[PDB]
Structure 1
């Protein structure tokens, strides 16, 4: 039972990837100068959007 052997060591790392990419304007400005704006207020549509890249279970 003569034995000649060679060994290799395998190292595997699962680095966590957590990315939150936001597109839009980092300043959102509401300007009230008319009466209508005062009574009803500015409604801004699609100001900021968020995209999520993840490896594990995530909650935003």
Structure 2
């Protein structure tokens, strides 16, 4: 079986892509100006929304 061949090398670089994105402001400001603000505290709902993408099992 006389042959003539050409060889290629396939190099797959499986990088560990971990991508955590956020859809909120980087700076979260708490301004305490009222007495009710002090006594009851300040609450901001949904300040950050994290979307997660990952190659590997993550925590």
TM-score, structure 2 as length reference: 0.78
Shift of 1:56: 0.4
Q: Distance in 2 between matches of 1:38 and 1:8?
A: 69
Shift of 1:42: 1.1
Structure 2 residue ranges without an equivalent (≥5): none
Q: Distance in 2 between matches of 1:3 and 1:29?
A: 73
Question: Alignment RMSD, CA only?
Answer: 1.6
* Number of residue-to-residue matches in the alignment: 59
